[PDB]
Amino acid sequence: THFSQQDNFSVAARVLGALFYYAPESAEAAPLVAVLTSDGWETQWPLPEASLAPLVTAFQTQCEETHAQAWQRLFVGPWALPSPPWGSVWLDRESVLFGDSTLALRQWMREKGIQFEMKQNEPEDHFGSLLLMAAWLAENGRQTECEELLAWHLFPWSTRFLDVFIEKAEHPFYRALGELARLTLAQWQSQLLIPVAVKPLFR
């Protein structure tokens, strides 16, 4: 019955999350770059074809800039990232990392006995970390928590983050990845029984 337990929710969340968290040449993400750059993946993605046809091609579009170089520029640095993948940049009035929305997520994790750990020195509210934790909760049959994560701790900023990211990606693969993410999270959003939390955006 619950939308986290069907339509490839966990599988799709893990794919989107890893491609946003790990480098395209990494052991974690290279196989995923390879699935999205081959025909066939669209058959298993939980969205309709009229919207996937264009992304199939777009994911395969060659480009002088390397996946590795695009990711570096979009997610690592050294310079300012065009769309910072951490919730508190979007939700905290001050746009700092480890901000108030980050604290809210951490407190919620601790109340619900959620033991999922992020890597060291890293804030909990990274877009991909959130998608991997949602996947992980789904797999564990923790549907209520999964829905709360999305409603309360991801969807309030994820659309804004994706909007700016899709507009500034400037690389066919990552722009396609962004659009895929937006279409998919939107679809999930429409399946929630619970309202998305109403929060101002500060970037």
From Swiss-Prot:
It is a peripheral membrane protein. Gene3D superfamilies: TorD-like (1.10.3480.10). One of its GO terms (biological process) is chaperone-mediated protein folding. One of its GO terms (cellular component) is plasma membrane. It comes from the Bacteria. InterPro entries: DmsD-type, DmsD_chaperone, DMSO/NO3_reduct_chaperone, TorD-like_sf, TorD/DmsD_chaperones. It is found in: Cell inner membrane; Cytoplasm. GO terms for molecular function: signal sequence binding. It holds the Pfam family Nitrate_red_del. Keywords: Cell inner membrane, Cell membrane, Chaperone, Cytoplasm, Membrane. Its main location: membrane. Belongs to the TorD/DmsD family. DmsD subfamily. Monomer and homodimer. Binds to the twin-arginine signal peptide of DmsA and TorA, although the latter binding is controversial. Interacts with the TatB and TatC subunits of the Tat translocase complex. Also interacts with other general chaperones, such as GroEL, and proteins involved in the molybdenum cofactor biosynthesis. Required for biogenesis/assembly of DMSO reductase, but not for the interaction of the DmsA signal peptide with the Tat system. May be part of a chaperone cascade complex that facilitates a folding-maturation pathway for the substrate protein. This is Tat proofreading chaperone DmsD.
